[PDB]
């Protein structure tokens, strides 16, 4: 599908939402060294501006 290569950190922006409930995917949930990928079902809005002209 249409995958937008959005280079981000911490927050995943403009990504594909999960259907039904939110999903918690991890290679090893009992492992702290492996990152925890979270996928929302309802998108949250964030407005960023650079007021400097």
């Amino acid at each position: 599908h249409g995958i937008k290569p959005v280079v981000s950190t911490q927050l995943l922006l403009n990504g594909s939402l999960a259907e039904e409930e939110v999903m918690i995917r991890s290679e090893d949930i009992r492992d702290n060294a492996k990152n925890i990928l979270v996928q929302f079902n309802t998108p949250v809005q964030i407005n960023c501006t650079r007021p400097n002209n």
């Epitope: 009992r30 492992d31 702290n32 060294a33």
Partner: antibody
């Protein structure tokens, strides 16, 4: 021929802080996380936290959450471990471990340093 | 310290020995370290049974339920160190090998 060289023995007063060096050689420094495990004299090993030399992101244990600060210098391939506000129980031998090159990553420490002995004596 | 290790395990030079490591839950990997006094630990067994190069085949590992065990067949005078079992970030109490008088 993975080479791990730490700093010499340090002596600090209780309440001060100390920074422990850990120089790596013989592999790609920015490809392996760097762990820190201490052992009190006559006791067992205790994992403190790992640091990713790539981005610098660490993972301090809850016991030392707010006391230890792990940094690195990718130019010289040296990881650092600083413990603030030293208590009486902080006297231990502090090692910096590294994962196996083979077999996945991170939790099978094949390479260890010679150890750094920091002590609190009042 | 969720991993339970006996403080002392007995064995004679030549015969086998076994060090038990009892840890709760069953869904992980167990590792073993050998720490001689004055030196750093040495990875002897990774992933329950596998063994890194190049430690002798006299060391072998096993796991059944909530109990992992390290076995050393044919004990020598150089097998004298502290043995710890590892699970993720946790460590065991340690085990001293007593050879023979």
């Amino acid at each position: 021929q993975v080479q791990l060289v730490q700093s010499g023995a340090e002596v600090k007063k209780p309440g001060a802080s100390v920074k422990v060096s850990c120089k790596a050689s013989g592999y790609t420094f920015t490809g392996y996380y760097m762990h820190w495990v201490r052992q009190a004299p006559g006791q067992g090993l205790e994992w403190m936290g790992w640091i990713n030399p790539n981005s610098g992101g660490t993972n301090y244990a809850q016991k030392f959450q707010g006391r230890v600060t792990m940094t690195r210098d990718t130019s010289i391939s040296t990881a650092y471990m600083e413990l603030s506000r030293l208590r009486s129980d902080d006297t231990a031998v502090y090692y910096c471990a590294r994962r196996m090159r083979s077999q996945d990553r991170e939790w099978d420490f094949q390479h260890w340093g010679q150890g750094t002995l920091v002590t609190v004596s009042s | 310290s969720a991993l339970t290790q006996p403080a002392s395990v007995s064995g004679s030079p030549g015969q086998s020995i076994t060090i038990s490591c009892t840890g709760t839950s069953s869904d992980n990997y167990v590792s073993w370290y050998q720490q001689h006094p004055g030196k750093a630990p040495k990875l002897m067994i990774y992933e329950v049974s596998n063994r890194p190069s190049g430690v002798s085949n006299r060391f072998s590992g096993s796991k059944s339920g909530n109990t992992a065990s390290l076995t050393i067949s044919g004990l020598q005078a150089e097998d004298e160190a502290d043995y710890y079992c590892s699970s993720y970030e946790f460590f065991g109490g340690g085990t001293k090998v007593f050879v023979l008088g």
